[PDB]
Design a protein around this ligand. Structure first.
Ligand SMILES: Nc1nc2c(ncn2[C@@H]2O[C@H](COP(=O)(O)OP(=O)(O)O)[C@@H](O)[C@H]2O)c(=O)[nH]1
Ligand code: ALF
Ligand SMILES: [Mg+2]
Lengths: 64, 624, 339, 317
């Protein structure tokens, strides 16, 4: 029962070769990028900043 | 027929089809054999199917052929059957039967011989054709639905005495009287051998009461003209009932004492009908043992049947040896203490009676001595001296029937009754005319306290597996009375609600196209101090038990997850289901019939166990 | 020899990956975000309640219109609600009672679902005859269908309990690509805005970034001490959050190929059932198995609020494409819309 | 004194032709008034035949050598079977030309693959006589006409010795249904078999072999219990057609147990005959066989002279 274990262990190492062969980014820049996304779209997000009840479909109106 | 046999709605089919399939009852041989199945099956073939029709008709015409009496009739008939069903189709090559079967019939008809089983090979091959697709198409049809309705009624038979009108009092017995009654359901007349349970233990006779029930059960199946057969057995708390065939003509000892002795030609009649009665019990490996004039009863017309089966005995497994029965008619081996015997003993008993019918006393008691050791000694020792008046035909018969040796006894040598029937005595008789009761009887009869003893639960346990119904009987009784007329009635009431529910809003398509396993009406509760009983239509799905009322889809259900246990609990002495739900909460169900209750018990248990097994290996659905 | 040299190569190549990641780890997100102003307290209110399901709700999914939504439930039904009006646009009964997932198409025409039937049943709302007719039986999976998401009207990705995912062509009813790799039942998945990548969460306590195009696993993230029950993409498509039976959520960045943040507390002991981001990504909404549904500051990792509107486990939840509302399905038979 | 005789057999086997011969020899011979009666039916046979042949060329995909005759083929195709008044010019030359086309001849030589008729070559080779204004059909023409019998008919002929009440019937499977109702007091059975059937399939069922149908039908009639008393007379008809067919179509092919030399009428005759004789359940019974041609009065005279004598030798004594 070597042919299964070996065929499996090769996929693993061919996979690990896949995963290790990427150009990673410094975590600090990863964060800065995400932080700066929210900073841009914080206005366009009604869950974050409460919108006018008039603009809210789940309050102002029963006709839609 | 005053009491209306109520017929369950066709929604019952979902439960029944599962109830019957679980027992492998939904096969052609199982259903076609039952009378009400045949009747529904044959209606389907004739009315609906195209190529089924001529096969049933063949089967029909053959069945009529079988019951033809004279050969001159059967000779005429065998041709028309052949010419119409065999030759006409065979010429055109649309005859779907074997060359063997065809050749078998030609082989006979060419030789001009017409056995009543001539077409028997064709009968078998008509099944093969009806057993395949044709049977499946029937199962798919409304006629199988109707069979389920009728079968539900059968399987939910519970008999109190309110089901019987009691017309007269026709007997007294060892442990209770015997009435003559009418079952209100169908109007069929029966005799109710009713027994007091207290008197039983007072005379320590629980054995011969229960033996009678087992013996009557073995005998009652297979339609028999010459035995007082059972249709139903039941009990009330103190009374024990058998519903037997109605013998309003009294017994043969009374009619002997009244009439005096009988002629040789008159006795021949009785003997022949008693012989076919004994033949029936012997073909089911039962011995009667109590064969004597008092145990022969006459019907209205003067025909006969064998009665008190209490002292009877099953010898298929092991043979008895004790001396049971009236010791004026018992055989040598029965008397011989610890000597084994079987059917042979009945033929010795017959001879003693047939002699007593001609002489007025048993062939052993001299001067009616009433002495056990005298009579029984003469049985073992002395041979009968048959009066010179006894013809040689009868001489031959009673010398054969009354051998002490069983190796020389007539009826015991190998072929049973057929030996006795061959005897030169019965040489005049067409033995099937005997069976068909076509011979005219010699005698038409005319029209005319220690109860303080205690009754234990131990005694009541004895009669727990007592109550019984015999399908053949009940179905026939129904077939010959209400069947067609109830069908006619139900056909309307269902068609009436088909038009009604069409025009209100299209119903009964909720269970369709989903994985619903079984659906039907039941009744639900919760606990005693708040809720009450409500009738709803349930749907069992693999993971939930939905239920609704009319005019809606289900608005409440019960998950298989939350069902802990299904248990049979009785509520006011009535079998019910107890569903214990996760949150210490209870929930009880109740069904119309026994078949339903049983199937809802099985299917819920199966369903919730299978759900909980399955859910518990799925991470989303499982608790933690 | 051949298998032991390959086993020791695996465990060196493995440590090459840990060092490539530790190299990026110069600062944490908790450090970086100290300065930004806190999100405050997200006092959320139950705007709607969606009464209809007869038993546990296992899944739900918004339409792209931010108004319609499907929901699959233990009652064997797949209901489409008009969140604005509470009225049911469709109440579809299923062939299998064992449904576990559902997925509104972005097209709005189709909805999909599946479960222990091991099939992804696709339904058509806009039929020839206007009925609710079944378009396809996508069979092929050898384990329970755990989740699935439409790419378009004719393509759909599905995860299963056979430890694989699969892309289907609805026309051919055939698995275009098969995404094998996981060593546990795949509980969840999530399409990136660019339909060319998707992540998946499994019981092997790991998530994996897949290439839809090609069919390979690009990266594998670990760190959870238990099953990953739910996973979804951050708005931009460079990160994703995971909910786990280890009572924590976590954020993962793809380009930094490691964990950025943990969302958990000593008080929270039961698992996460579901997750979703608000339109901007500042809020991470986690569903729980204590009938609660906590709102996290995705950057600060502080618990901003709680949605406590259900009597049983909060099984599933979502956010609208216009970010206007949060839906939350539950085991108590109700969905609830929030603002 | 009358005697009931059943002419039984597979379709088109010459049962109705056998009757027409009895009328020529014994009964009221064919008057010139009666001979006119068939004129219309003659024309219809020529159309029905030709049409059946035209269709068969399109089925078998056989090319017309002269493409001119495609115009005549459409002309004939639309002609109604029953609406034939007379055989007039627009169709006469067209049908003769069609017949003379070597593509039609290839189709005719493949007559085994589709149902044609047995007198087509007889009539089509003689279209000149048929198209004449005062064309009076001969006694042969009358024997050659195809008039599908349906249902039992009684034709009682009487020689100066005895009355023979002969029963003509239909041969096709549907017609065999009606047979039962005159199986009563049958003196003798005249079973007809077409010898040229060997390489043909049934019209009632294009799957099955005609010779083999007769083979079964004979066995059915023989084994019938109430014919145990009756006499059996086998008539292997169409001897003259077997004499043509066996030159190109081998009997060895359709009945593998045949040892004899192919292209021999006499060797085939005897084998075919034995097949039917071996279907007798008991050789205690004797089957009286004759090779015959129902369109040949000179053959039927000689045969029926011997057959009559056999019937009376057996049934008087
Ligand atoms: N050449 C030839 N033609 C025959 C013979 N027997 C019958 N035919 C023709 O074939 C056709 C069929 O014969 P017919 O008596 O009508 O058939 P049946 O009554 O159904 O058995 C008729 O047109 C006959 O003229 C034969 O022995 N030789
Ligand atoms: F046997 Al026929 F016309 F075919 F009489
Ligand atoms: Mg004819």
């Amino acid at each position: 029962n070597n042919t299964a274990s070996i065929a499996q262990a090769r996929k693993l190492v061919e996979q690990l070769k896949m995963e290790a062969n990427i150009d990673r980014i410094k975590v600090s820049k990863a964060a800065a990028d995400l932080m700066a996304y929210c900073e841009a779209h914080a206005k366009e997000d009604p869950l974050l900043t409460p919108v006018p009840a008039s603009e809210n479909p789940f309050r102002e109106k029963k006709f839609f | 027929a005053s009491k209306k046999i109520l017929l369950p709605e066709p929604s019952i089919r979902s439960v029944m089809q599962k109830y019957l399939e679980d027992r492998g009852e939904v096969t052609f041989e199982k259903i076609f054999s039952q009378k009400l199945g045949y009747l529904l099956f044959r209606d389907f073939c004739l009315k609906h199917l195209e190529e089924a029709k001529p096969l049933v008709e063949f089967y029909e015409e053959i069945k009529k052929y079988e019951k033809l009496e004279t050969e001159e009739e059967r000779l005429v008939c065998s041709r028309e059957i052949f010419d119409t069903y065999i030759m006409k189709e065979l010429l055109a090559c649309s005859h779907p039967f074997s060359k063997s079967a065809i050749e078998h019939v030609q082989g006979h008809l060419v030789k001009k011989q017409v056995p009543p089983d001539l077409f028997q090979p064709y009968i078998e091959e008509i099944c093969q054709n009806l057993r395949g697709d044709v049977f499946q198409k029937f199962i798919e049809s409304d006629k199988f639905t109707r069979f389920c309705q009728w079968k539900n009624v059968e399987l939910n038979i519970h008999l109190t005495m309110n089901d019987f009108s009691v017309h007269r009092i026709i007997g007294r017995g060892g442990f209770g009287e015997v009435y003559g009654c009418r079952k209100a359901d169908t109007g069929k007349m029966y005799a109710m051998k009713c027994l007091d349970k207290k008197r039983i233990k007072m005379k320590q006779g629980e054995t011969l009461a229960l033996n009678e029930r087992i013996m009557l059960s073995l005998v009652s199946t297979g339609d028999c003209p010459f035995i007082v057969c059972m249709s139903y057995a039941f009990h009330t708390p103190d009374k024990l009932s058998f519903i037997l065939d109605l013998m309003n003509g009294g017994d043969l000892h009374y009619h002997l004492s009244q009439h005096g002795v009988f002629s040789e030609a008159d006795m021949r009649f009785y003997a022949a009908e008693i012989i076919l009665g004994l033949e029936h019990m012997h073909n089911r490996f039962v011995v009667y043992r109590d064969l004597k004039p008092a145990n022969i009863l006459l019907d209205e017309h003067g025909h006969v049947r064998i009665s008190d089966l209490g002292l009877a005995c099953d010898f298929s497994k092991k043979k008895p040896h004790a001396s049971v029965g009236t010791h004026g008619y018992m055989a040598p081996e029965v008397l011989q203490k610890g000597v084994a015997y079987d059917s042979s003993a009945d033929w010795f008993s017959l001879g003693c009676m047939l002699f007593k019918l001609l002489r007025g006393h048993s062939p052993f008691r001299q001067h009616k001595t009433k002495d056990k050791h005298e009579i029984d000694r003469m049985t073992l020792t002395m041979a009968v001296e048959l009066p010179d008046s006894f013809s040689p035909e009868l001489r031959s018969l009673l010398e054969g029937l009354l051998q002490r040796d069983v190796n020389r006894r007539l009826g015991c040598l190998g072929r049973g009754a057929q030996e006795v029937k061959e005897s030169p005595f019965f040489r005049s008789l067409d033995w099937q005319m005997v069976f068909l009761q076509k011979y005219p009887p010699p005698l038409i009869p005319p029209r005319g306290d220690t109860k303080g003893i205690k009754l234990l639960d131990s005694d009541q346990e004895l009669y727990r597996n007592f109550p019984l119904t015999i399908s053949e009987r009940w179905q026939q009784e129904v077939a010959e009375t209400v069947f067609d007329t109830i069908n006619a009635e139900t056909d309307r009431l269902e068609a009436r609600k088909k038009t009604k529910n069409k025009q209100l809003g299209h119903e009964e398509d909720y269970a369709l196209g989903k994985d619903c396993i079984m659906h039907g009406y039941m009744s639900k509760m919760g606990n005693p101090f708040l809720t009450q009983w409500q009738r709803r239509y349930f749907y069992l799905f693999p993971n939930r038990l939905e239920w609704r009322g009319e005019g809606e889809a289900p608005q409440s259900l019960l998950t298989m997850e939350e069902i802990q246990s299904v248990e049979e609990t009785q509520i006011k002495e009535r079998k019910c289901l107890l569903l214990k739900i996760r949150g210490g909460k209870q929930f009880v169900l109740q069904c119309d019939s026994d078949p339903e209750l049983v199937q809802w018990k099985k299917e819920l248990r199966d369903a919730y166990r299978e759900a909980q097994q399955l859910v518990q290996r799925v991470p989303k659905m499982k608790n933690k | 020899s051949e298998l032991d040299q390959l086993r020791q190569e695996a465990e060196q190549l493995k440590n090459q990956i840990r060092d490539a990641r530790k190299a990026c780890a110069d600062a944490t997100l908790s450090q970086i975000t100290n300065n930004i102003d806190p999100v405050g307290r997200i006092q959320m209110r139950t705007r709607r309640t969606l009464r209809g399901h007869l038993a546990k709700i296992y899944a739900m999914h918004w339409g792209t219109d931010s108004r319609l939504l499907v929901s699959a439930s233990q009652d064997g039904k797949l209901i489409i609600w008009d969140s604005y009006t509470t009225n049911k646009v469709h109440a579809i009964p299923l062939r299998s009672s064992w449904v576990m997932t559902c997925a509104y198409a972005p097209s709005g025409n189709y909805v999909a679902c599946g479960g222990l039937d091991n099939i992804c049943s696709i339904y058509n709302l806009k039929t020839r005859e206007g009925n609710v007719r079944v378009s396809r039986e996508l069979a092929g999976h050898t384990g329970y269908l755990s989740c699935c998401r439409f790419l378009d009207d004719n393509q759909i990705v599905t995860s299963s309990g056979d430890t694989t995912c699969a892309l289907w062509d609805i026309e051919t009813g055939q698995q275009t690509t098969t995404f094998t790799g996981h060593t546990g039942d795949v509980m969840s998945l999530s399409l990136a805005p660019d339909t060319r990548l998707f992540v998946s969460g499994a019981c092997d306590a790991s998530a994996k970034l897949w290439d839809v195009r090609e069919g390979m696993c690009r990266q594998t993230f670990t760190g959870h001490e238990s099953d990953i029950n739910a996973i979804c993409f951050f708005p931009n498509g460079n990160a994703f959050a995971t909910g786990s039976d280890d009572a924590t959520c976590r954020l993962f960045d793809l380009r930094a190929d490691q964990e950025l943040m943990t969302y958990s507390h000593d008080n929270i002991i039961c698992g996460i059932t579901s997750v979703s981001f608000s339109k901007s990504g500042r809020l991470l909404l986690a569903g729980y198995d204590d009938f609660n549904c906590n709102v996290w500051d995705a950057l600060k990792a502080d618990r901003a609020g709680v949605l406590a509107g259900h009597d049983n486990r909060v099984s599933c939840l979502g956010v609208t494409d216009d970010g206007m509302a949060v839906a939350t399905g539950s085991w108590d038979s109700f969905l609830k819309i929030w603002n | 004194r009358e005697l009931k005789l059943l002419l039984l057999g597979t379709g088109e086997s010459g049962k109705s032709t056998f009757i027409k011969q009895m009328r020529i020899i014994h009964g009221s011979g064919y008057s010139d008034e009666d001979k006119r009666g068939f004129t219309k039916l003659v024309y219809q046979n020529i159309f029905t035949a030709m049409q059946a042949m035209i269709r068969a060329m399109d089925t078998l995909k056989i090319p017309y050598k002269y493409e001119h005759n495609k115009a005549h083929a459409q002309l004939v195709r639309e002609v109604d079977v029953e609406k034939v008044s007379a055989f007039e010019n627009p169709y006469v030359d067209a049908i003769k030309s069609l017949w003379n086309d070597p593509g039609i001849q290839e189709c005719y030589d493949r007559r085994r693959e589709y149902q044609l008729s047995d007198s087509t070559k007889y009539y089509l080779n003689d279209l000149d006589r048929v198209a004449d204004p005062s064309y009076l059909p001969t006694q042969q023409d009358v024997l050659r006409v195809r008039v599908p019998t349906t249902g039992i008919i009684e034709y009682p002929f009487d020689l100066q010795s005895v009355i023979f009440r002969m029963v003509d019937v239909g041969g096709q499977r549907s017609e065999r249904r009606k047979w039962i109702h005159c199986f009563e007091n049958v003196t003798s059975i005249m079973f007809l078999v077409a010898l040229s059937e060997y390489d043909q399939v049934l019209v009632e069922s294009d799957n099955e072999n005609r010779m083999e149908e007769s083979k079964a039908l004979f066995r059915t009639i023989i084994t019938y219990p109430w014919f145990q008393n009756s006499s059996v007379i086998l008539f292997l008809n169409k001897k003259d057609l077997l004499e043509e067919k066996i030159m190109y179509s081998h009997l060895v092919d359709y009945f593998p147990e045949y040892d004899g030399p192919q292209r021999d009428a006499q060797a085939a005759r005897e084998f075919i005959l034995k097949m039917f004789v071996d279907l007798n359940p008991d050789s205690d019974k004797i089957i009286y066989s004759h090779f015959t041609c129902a369109t040949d009065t000179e053959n039927i005279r000689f045969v029926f002279a011997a057959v009559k004598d056999t019937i009376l030798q057996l049934n008087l004594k």
